[PDB]
């Protein structure tokens, strides 16, 4: 997260870290056994780290659980990034407390202008690399679909939404993928892609979760 | 050596943090970079020895 601020300790209890030796992607806890992330964050073996704040120091509030089943959206496209969503079933149910909690799936698609919270342990610089120990937060609005299409000509599908600022300076970056975009207590987006980080006329592009509520519920009930 | 070996490391549009190997034409050695997760160019390898075989 570029241009953000350090989140208050455990103020984003649904945020998880995907680890395969090191932190590589984020994710969101939707129920005691399932995590939602981006499909491009696929790895054959993933350990999910919950209740985290400082990713490099053992604080004592963390729960380390391995991935049992990793299910990507059947229509995921590796080139266009359409349907960039993935479900992860945990090996054992997690203990829900004040540090570890679930985020609600969307009731409907939030309109343009809705203020949201983006979070992650990704790069904090637009030019250069600086990986934070502590979870970073960013308050940003859902942008009009016309402005998203103007920023990325012919690259935006109906399953994508732009969140951020057209002036740049504030955006999600490398290491934030799979992470949450929560608006009014509901998961409206998943960190996906963008051209660079925090660059003018190039806001981040996110997977529009409201188009996948039925797919998520049907997959959880069948597995 | 081929053209891709002299090309700068490509992070790509995706936002994952995946450590991959590339060949530096300036230093003449195999170094690491942050790959985003999608649309990789040819100067992107999973291991150090796979980079030394193809590019070295
Ligand atoms: Ca920790």
UniProtKB/Swiss-Prot annotation, chain A:
The keyword Disulfide bond applies. Its main location: secreted. It is found in: Secreted, Extracellular space. Residues 1-221 form the Peptidase S1 domain. One of its GO terms (biological process) is collagen catabolic process. One of its GO terms (cellular component) is extracellular space. Belongs to the peptidase S1 family. Disulfide bonds join 7-137, 25-41, 109-210, 116-183, 148-162, 173-197. This is Anionic trypsin-2. The record marks 171 as: Required for specificity. Pfam families: Trypsin. It is an enzyme of class 3 (hydrolase). Binds 1 Ca(2+) ion per subunit. It comes from the Eukaryota. It catalyses: Preferential cleavage: Arg-|-Xaa, Lys-|-Xaa. InterPro entries: Peptidase_S1_PA (IPR009003), Peptidase_S1_PA_chymotrypsin (IPR043504), Peptidase_S1A (IPR001314), Serine_Proteases_S1 (IPR050127), Trypsin_dom (IPR001254), TRYPSIN_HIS (IPR018114), TRYPSIN_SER (IPR033116). Ca(2+) binds at residues 52, 54, 57, 62. Keywords: Calcium, Digestion, Disulfide bond, Hydrolase, Metal-binding, Protease, Secreted, Serine protease, Signal, Zymogen. It comes from Rattus norvegicus (Rat). The gene is Prss2. Its cofactor is Ca(2+). PROSITE patterns: TRYPSIN_DOM, TRYPSIN_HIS, TRYPSIN_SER. GO terms for molecular function: calcium ion binding; serine-type endopeptidase activity. Its EC number is 3.4.21.4. The active site is at residues 40, 84, 177.
Curated annotation (Swiss-Prot), chain B:
Coiled coil: none annotated. The record marks 15-16 as: Reactive bond for trypsin. Disulfide bonds join 5-55, 14-38, 30-51. It is found in: Secreted. GO terms for molecular function: calcium ion binding; molecular function inhibitor activity; potassium channel inhibitor activity; protease binding; serine-type endopeptidase inhibitor activity; sulfate binding; zymogen binding. Residues 5-55 form the BPTI/Kunitz inhibitor domain. Keywords: Disulfide bond, Pharmaceutical, Protease inhibitor, Secreted, Serine protease inhibitor, Signal. It comes from the Eukaryota. GO terms for cellular component: extracellular space; serine protease inhibitor complex. GO terms for biological process: negative regulation of platelet aggregation; negative regulation of serine-type endopeptidase activity; negative regulation of thrombin-activated receptor signaling pathway; trypsinogen activation. Inhibits trypsin, kallikrein, chymotrypsin, and plasmin. This is Pancreatic trypsin inhibitor. It comes from Bos taurus. The chain holds residues 36 to 91 of 100 of the full protein.
């Amino acid at each position: 997260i570029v241009g953000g601020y350090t989140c208050q300790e455990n103020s984003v209890p649904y945020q998880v870290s995907l680890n395969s030796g090191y932190h590589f992607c984020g994710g969101s806890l939707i129920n005691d056994q399932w995590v939602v992330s981006a499909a491009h964050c696929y790895k054959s073996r993933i350990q999910v780290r919950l209740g985290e704040h400082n990713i490099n120091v053992l604080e004592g509030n963390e729960q380390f659980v391995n991935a049992a089943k990793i299910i990507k959206h059947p229509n995921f496209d590796r080139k266009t990034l359409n349907n960039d969503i993935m479900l992860i079933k945990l090996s054992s149910p997690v203990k829900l407390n004040a540090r570890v909690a679930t985020v609600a799936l969307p009731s409907s698609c939030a309109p343009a202008g809705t203020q949201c919270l983006i979070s992650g342990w990704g790069n904090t610089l637009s030019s250069g690399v600086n990986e934070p120990d502590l979870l970073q937060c960013l308050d940003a609005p859902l942008l009009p679909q016309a402005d998203c299409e103007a920023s990325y000509p012919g690259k935006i599908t109906d399953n994508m939404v732009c969140v951020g600022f057209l002036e740049g300076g504030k955006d999600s970056c490398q290491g934030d993928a799979g992470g949450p975009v929560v608006c009014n207590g509901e998961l409206q987006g998943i960190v996906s892609w963008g051209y660079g980080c925090a660059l003018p006329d190039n806001p981040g592009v996110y997977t529009k979760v409201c188009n996948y509520v039925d797919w998520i519920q049907d997959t959880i009930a069948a597995n | 050596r081929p053209d891709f070996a002299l090309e700068p490391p490509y992070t790509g549009p995706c936002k994952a943090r995946i450590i991959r190997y590339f060949y530096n034409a300036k230093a003449g050695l195999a170094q690491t970079f942050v790959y985003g997760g999608c649309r990789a160019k040819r100067n992107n390898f999973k291991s150090a020895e796979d980079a030394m075989r193809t590019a070295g």
